[PDB]
């Protein structure tokens, strides 16, 4: 059971008898004079607690209602008196006619105080009766009232009215009138609110709430199924994406989240296309189209990054370039600086070929500190290090910076990184088949090893193939069988000099599928 | 656990005066022979002390140079050439400390083991921290390598 308040006005009129039905359920028709009474009856038949409050004016009640020789007035009076028999609560509230902005302010205060004093679950504005003036003003003010009382009462709010001008006419002056429900117009502007919030700041609160509401209302009528709706999944993924961005995280999870967002977005849009109605379909289709526009605009896609999670590549460099640009756009400056540092680390790993230890931090530091392109990269390094510590150290000791000069410095970094990225367009690498450290017998050694995936394996393998720098050392045959069966020189010779890099694999083939590239190995000593 | 604290005692003592000798006494920080003799006998006494006072993780046993890390690991490995006596010493240290996880897979290895040095658990893993021993290739011809390539994962 829910507790419910119906708010209507009450103006001079003929108040003909009407067959009100909810346009959702044309089955239940209630023949009454007041639309609020019909709505109250439809709600008490749902086992709820319902109360109606009318706003009357002195000009109306001591000139129309209690005029005993106005047939329409006594008709509506008799109905207002028999309202109490159905189990519904009726009361009256004096207001002015609203002839100026001061009186309209008074009316706003009256409605606002009523909503504050309501202690139930739902409130319905029934705009059927009263002045056209009052109906228009209330319709305009309802959204303000909801936004006001989001943090006040936690109250559900509906806007309905009997659209008697579009009602069927069954007998003389007798009309079949639908109680239209325009409450969907309230959360029509919340859509654009979410759009601005995400487009300018990347905030998902409005987006998550709106998506949950959208999935509810598309689940109203069950013609549309799941396995491709997954708006719950899309809202959860947006939550994860915000947690990943405002808390800095590796490029792999960010690229995966962007790929997931794109996949779920297009899948859910295609699914939603086939649902033919009972509410406003077009605005939310426009909403999804606009959100897909912004997603494909501001979120950089690279569908095939997740396959290189253990190393540092140039694709990750450009991806983080676009990510930092996005972070700057959303005014997320600190996170942008933090990501820039690691992007520079990755670039110098690429430029120095030390990219095996993108999962080791001691190496990251040791080359955080210790032929022109080296000189240009040093140019960029010195530029960036010239201003990073103002952001990093919080500006203490008289060394802070405004947004203008920070924007200056960030676009400096952007320009130089795009420069050197466009400008960046192979020792002996043996080929092994097991995890080993065979050092020459006269050596006194330090060795690094890293787990890999199959794609990286293939890439560096053909790099060794067609740079003449491959010293292949496969000793048996079925290895080559799987090599050409999967990946598209059997020099069976036993040595590892400090510095040489090599590749490894350890164990028809379907069973196997049920490891194929890993354990890249290099002697730093 | 006190002996770390006594060794730190000696460390701090020695470091308290090494740089006078090391840096040539510039910046008004030199020392005569008398106080240097003082300090040197300080070091002598403490070192003899802790030497008299100083009187074993799981150590697997392998038979080839390897780095088999568990398949869920992301690793750094140190390796050092050795001689046969050190090999024998740490081998029996593993034997009678219960800390040996021997992983010899075949038989003639044990034949040479008992023919030279006086558990064939043929199982394939190397966790970061475990230390292990290695050897690579009748036996007179061989004589004409026997202990080397001690191996340990610092990562």
mmCIF file of N, CA and C in Angstrom, chain B residues 38-104:
data_model
loop_
_atom_site.group_PDB
_atom_site.id
_atom_site.type_symbol
_atom_site.label_atom_id
_atom_site.label_comp_id
_atom_site.label_asym_id
_atom_site.label_seq_id
_atom_site.Cartn_x
_atom_site.Cartn_y
_atom_site.Cartn_z
ATOM 1 N N UNK B 38 92.851 3.448 18.231
ATOM 2 C CA UNK B 38 91.669 3.282 19.071
ATOM 3 C C UNK B 38 90.534 2.636 18.278
ATOM 4 N N UNK B 39 90.150 3.284 17.173
ATOM 5 C CA UNK B 39 89.004 2.844 16.382
ATOM 6 C C UNK B 39 89.242 1.471 15.761
ATOM 7 N N UNK B 40 90.460 1.228 15.275
ATOM 8 C CA UNK B 40 90.755 -0.051 14.647
ATOM 9 C C UNK B 40 90.660 -1.190 15.652
ATOM 10 N N UNK B 41 91.143 -0.986 16.881
ATOM 11 C CA UNK B 41 90.993 -2.058 17.862
ATOM 12 C C UNK B 41 89.552 -2.184 18.342
ATOM 13 N N UNK B 42 88.780 -1.094 18.307
ATOM 14 C CA UNK B 42 87.338 -1.212 18.510
ATOM 15 C C UNK B 42 86.742 -2.208 17.524
ATOM 16 N N UNK B 43 87.043 -2.003 16.239
ATOM 17 C CA UNK B 43 86.540 -2.898 15.203
ATOM 18 C C UNK B 43 87.038 -4.323 15.417
ATOM 19 N N UNK B 44 88.320 -4.481 15.768
ATOM 20 C CA UNK B 44 88.880 -5.811 16.010
ATOM 21 C C UNK B 44 88.110 -6.547 17.099
ATOM 22 N N UNK B 45 87.896 -5.876 18.234
ATOM 23 C CA UNK B 45 87.219 -6.509 19.358
ATOM 24 C C UNK B 45 85.797 -6.904 18.985
ATOM 25 N N UNK B 46 85.057 -5.994 18.340
ATOM 26 C CA UNK B 46 83.666 -6.306 18.016
ATOM 27 C C UNK B 46 83.566 -7.415 16.975
ATOM 28 N N UNK B 47 84.495 -7.447 16.015
ATOM 29 C CA UNK B 47 84.440 -8.479 14.985
ATOM 30 C C UNK B 47 84.769 -9.841 15.577
ATOM 31 N N UNK B 48 85.779 -9.920 16.451
ATOM 32 C CA UNK B 48 86.056 -11.198 17.108
ATOM 33 C C UNK B 48 84.876 -11.635 17.972
ATOM 34 N N UNK B 49 84.280 -10.689 18.705
ATOM 35 C CA UNK B 49 83.039 -10.930 19.434
ATOM 36 C C UNK B 49 81.995 -11.622 18.566
ATOM 37 N N UNK B 50 81.566 -10.946 17.499
ATOM 38 C CA UNK B 50 80.458 -11.454 16.702
ATOM 39 C C UNK B 50 80.853 -12.701 15.917
ATOM 40 N N UNK B 51 82.139 -12.868 15.596
ATOM 41 C CA UNK B 51 82.590 -14.102 14.964
ATOM 42 C C UNK B 51 82.430 -15.287 15.904
ATOM 43 N N UNK B 52 82.835 -15.123 17.166
ATOM 44 C CA UNK B 52 82.599 -16.183 18.139
ATOM 45 C C UNK B 52 81.110 -16.380 18.401
ATOM 46 N N UNK B 53 80.303 -15.328 18.232
ATOM 47 C CA UNK B 53 78.876 -15.421 18.525
ATOM 48 C C UNK B 53 78.061 -16.055 17.402
ATOM 49 N N UNK B 54 78.612 -16.167 16.190
ATOM 50 C CA UNK B 54 77.875 -16.690 15.044
ATOM 51 C C UNK B 54 78.003 -18.202 14.892
ATOM 52 N N UNK B 55 78.255 -18.922 15.980
ATOM 53 C CA UNK B 55 78.324 -20.378 15.927
ATOM 54 C C UNK B 55 77.210 -21.008 16.757
ATOM 55 N N UNK B 56 67.904 -20.841 6.306
ATOM 56 C CA UNK B 56 67.800 -22.124 5.623
ATOM 57 C C UNK B 56 66.389 -22.357 5.081
ATOM 58 N N UNK B 57 66.034 -21.626 4.025
ATOM 59 C CA UNK B 57 64.725 -21.760 3.399
ATOM 60 C C UNK B 57 64.657 -23.068 2.611
ATOM 61 N N UNK B 58 63.514 -23.311 1.969
ATOM 62 C CA UNK B 58 63.402 -24.468 1.089
ATOM 63 C C UNK B 58 64.347 -24.303 -0.093
ATOM 64 N N UNK B 59 65.227 -25.281 -0.287
ATOM 65 C CA UNK B 59 66.235 -25.243 -1.343
ATOM 66 C C UNK B 59 65.998 -26.455 -2.234
ATOM 67 N N UNK B 60 65.395 -26.225 -3.397
ATOM 68 C CA UNK B 60 65.141 -27.306 -4.333
ATOM 69 C C UNK B 60 66.448 -27.782 -4.967
ATOM 70 N N UNK B 61 66.360 -28.916 -5.654
ATOM 71 C CA UNK B 61 67.504 -29.529 -6.311
ATOM 72 C C UNK B 61 67.145 -29.793 -7.765
ATOM 73 N N UNK B 62 67.844 -29.126 -8.679
ATOM 74 C CA UNK B 62 67.584 -29.212 -10.110
ATOM 75 C C UNK B 62 68.758 -29.880 -10.816
ATOM 76 N N UNK B 63 68.626 -30.034 -12.140
ATOM 77 C CA UNK B 63 69.684 -30.649 -12.932
ATOM 78 C C UNK B 63 69.873 -29.972 -14.289
ATOM 79 N N UNK B 64 69.492 -28.699 -14.415
ATOM 80 C CA UNK B 64 69.737 -27.921 -15.628
ATOM 81 C C UNK B 64 69.357 -26.468 -15.366
ATOM 82 N N UNK B 65 69.908 -25.571 -16.187
ATOM 83 C CA UNK B 65 69.674 -24.136 -16.044
ATOM 84 C C UNK B 65 68.283 -23.785 -16.559
ATOM 85 N N UNK B 66 67.452 -23.204 -15.687
ATOM 86 C CA UNK B 66 66.027 -23.020 -15.953
ATOM 87 C C UNK B 66 65.511 -21.803 -15.193
ATOM 88 N N UNK B 67 64.330 -21.311 -15.614
ATOM 89 C CA UNK B 67 63.596 -20.305 -14.855
ATOM 90 C C UNK B 67 62.107 -20.621 -14.835
ATOM 91 N N UNK B 68 61.678 -21.807 -14.410
ATOM 92 C CA UNK B 68 60.249 -22.109 -14.526
ATOM 93 C C UNK B 68 59.449 -21.398 -13.450
ATOM 94 N N UNK B 69 58.835 -20.281 -13.821
ATOM 95 C CA UNK B 69 58.006 -19.508 -12.905
ATOM 96 C C UNK B 69 56.580 -20.022 -13.054
ATOM 97 N N UNK B 70 55.757 -19.965 -12.008
ATOM 98 C CA UNK B 70 54.363 -20.382 -12.159
ATOM 99 C C UNK B 70 53.688 -19.555 -13.239
ATOM 100 N N UNK B 71 52.792 -20.207 -13.980
ATOM 101 C CA UNK B 71 52.223 -19.615 -15.184
ATOM 102 C C UNK B 71 51.431 -18.344 -14.908
ATOM 103 N N UNK B 72 51.097 -18.064 -13.650
ATOM 104 C CA UNK B 72 50.378 -16.853 -13.279
ATOM 105 C C UNK B 72 51.302 -15.723 -12.834
ATOM 106 N N UNK B 73 52.616 -15.902 -12.940
ATOM 107 C CA UNK B 73 53.560 -14.876 -12.527
ATOM 108 C C UNK B 73 53.856 -13.918 -13.675
ATOM 109 N N UNK B 74 54.101 -12.658 -13.323
ATOM 110 C CA UNK B 74 54.460 -11.640 -14.304
ATOM 111 C C UNK B 74 55.905 -11.815 -14.760
ATOM 112 N N UNK B 75 59.572 -11.300 -13.847
ATOM 113 C CA UNK B 75 60.503 -11.975 -12.960
ATOM 114 C C UNK B 75 61.969 -11.635 -13.181
ATOM 115 N N UNK B 76 62.733 -11.605 -12.091
ATOM 116 C CA UNK B 76 64.163 -11.337 -12.126
ATOM 117 C C UNK B 76 64.909 -12.501 -11.490
ATOM 118 N N UNK B 77 65.999 -12.911 -12.131
ATOM 119 C CA UNK B 77 66.723 -14.113 -11.740
ATOM 120 C C UNK B 77 68.223 -13.861 -11.730
ATOM 121 N N UNK B 78 68.888 -14.336 -10.680
ATOM 122 C CA UNK B 78 70.334 -14.280 -10.547
ATOM 123 C C UNK B 78 70.924 -15.684 -10.646
ATOM 124 N N UNK B 79 72.096 -15.766 -11.273
ATOM 125 C CA UNK B 79 72.794 -17.024 -11.509
ATOM 126 C C UNK B 79 74.286 -16.786 -11.312
ATOM 127 N N UNK B 80 74.971 -17.769 -10.728
ATOM 128 C CA UNK B 80 76.400 -17.629 -10.485
ATOM 129 C C UNK B 80 77.115 -18.951 -10.719
ATOM 130 N N UNK B 81 78.244 -18.886 -11.422
ATOM 131 C CA UNK B 81 79.091 -20.059 -11.583
ATOM 132 C C UNK B 81 79.745 -20.411 -10.255
ATOM 133 N N UNK B 82 79.891 -21.708 -9.999
ATOM 134 C CA UNK B 82 80.416 -22.184 -8.729
ATOM 135 C C UNK B 82 81.457 -23.268 -8.978
ATOM 136 N N UNK B 83 82.105 -23.689 -7.897
ATOM 137 C CA UNK B 83 82.976 -24.853 -7.896
ATOM 138 C C UNK B 83 82.303 -26.005 -7.154
ATOM 139 N N UNK B 84 82.922 -27.181 -7.245
ATOM 140 C CA UNK B 84 82.277 -28.411 -6.788
ATOM 141 C C UNK B 84 82.157 -28.485 -5.266
ATOM 142 N N UNK B 85 83.126 -27.929 -4.531
ATOM 143 C CA UNK B 85 83.106 -28.023 -3.071
ATOM 144 C C UNK B 85 81.932 -27.248 -2.477
ATOM 145 N N UNK B 86 81.713 -26.022 -2.960
ATOM 146 C CA UNK B 86 80.575 -25.219 -2.520
ATOM 147 C C UNK B 86 79.262 -25.934 -2.819
ATOM 148 N N UNK B 87 79.184 -26.527 -4.013
ATOM 149 C CA UNK B 87 78.055 -27.347 -4.424
ATOM 150 C C UNK B 87 77.766 -28.432 -3.392
ATOM 151 N N UNK B 88 78.791 -29.207 -3.032
ATOM 152 C CA UNK B 88 78.615 -30.281 -2.058
ATOM 153 C C UNK B 88 78.156 -29.739 -0.706
ATOM 154 N N UNK B 89 78.763 -28.635 -0.261
ATOM 155 C CA UNK B 89 78.448 -28.080 1.054
ATOM 156 C C UNK B 89 76.970 -27.717 1.138
ATOM 157 N N UNK B 90 76.516 -26.831 0.246
ATOM 158 C CA UNK B 90 75.117 -26.416 0.313
ATOM 159 C C UNK B 90 74.172 -27.570 -0.004
ATOM 160 N N UNK B 91 74.625 -28.568 -0.769
ATOM 161 C CA UNK B 91 73.781 -29.725 -1.038
ATOM 162 C C UNK B 91 73.464 -30.486 0.242
ATOM 163 N N UNK B 92 74.485 -30.800 1.045
ATOM 164 C CA UNK B 92 74.159 -31.494 2.291
ATOM 165 C C UNK B 92 73.476 -30.578 3.303
ATOM 166 N N UNK B 93 73.721 -29.265 3.235
ATOM 167 C CA UNK B 93 72.922 -28.342 4.036
ATOM 168 C C UNK B 93 71.440 -28.497 3.723
ATOM 169 N N UNK B 94 71.099 -28.598 2.438
ATOM 170 C CA UNK B 94 69.720 -28.894 2.067
ATOM 171 C C UNK B 94 69.303 -30.289 2.522
ATOM 172 N N UNK B 95 70.232 -31.249 2.508
ATOM 173 C CA UNK B 95 69.890 -32.629 2.858
ATOM 174 C C UNK B 95 69.401 -32.723 4.297
ATOM 175 N N UNK B 96 70.174 -32.186 5.243
ATOM 176 C CA UNK B 96 69.895 -32.449 6.651
ATOM 177 C C UNK B 96 69.315 -31.243 7.389
ATOM 178 N N UNK B 97 68.696 -30.311 6.665
ATOM 179 C CA UNK B 97 67.849 -29.285 7.262
ATOM 180 C C UNK B 97 66.374 -29.488 6.931
ATOM 181 N N UNK B 98 66.024 -30.598 6.274
ATOM 182 C CA UNK B 98 64.679 -30.950 5.822
ATOM 183 C C UNK B 98 64.195 -30.003 4.723
ATOM 184 N N UNK B 99 65.038 -29.085 4.264
ATOM 185 C CA UNK B 99 64.617 -28.015 3.372
ATOM 186 C C UNK B 99 64.962 -28.323 1.913
ATOM 187 N N UNK B 100 65.182 -29.590 1.577
ATOM 188 C CA UNK B 100 65.501 -29.984 0.211
ATOM 189 C C UNK B 100 64.240 -30.474 -0.485
ATOM 190 N N UNK B 101 63.921 -29.865 -1.623
ATOM 191 C CA UNK B 101 62.875 -30.352 -2.515
ATOM 192 C C UNK B 101 63.578 -30.846 -3.778
ATOM 193 N N UNK B 102 64.057 -32.086 -3.725
ATOM 194 C CA UNK B 102 64.869 -32.626 -4.807
ATOM 195 C C UNK B 102 64.010 -32.940 -6.023
ATOM 196 N N UNK B 103 64.526 -32.603 -7.202
ATOM 197 C CA UNK B 103 63.768 -32.727 -8.443
ATOM 198 C C UNK B 103 64.628 -33.330 -9.552
ATOM 199 N N UNK B 104 65.304 -34.436 -9.252
ATOM 200 C CA UNK B 104 66.079 -35.163 -10.252
ATOM 201 C C UNK B 104 65.149 -36.119 -10.985
#
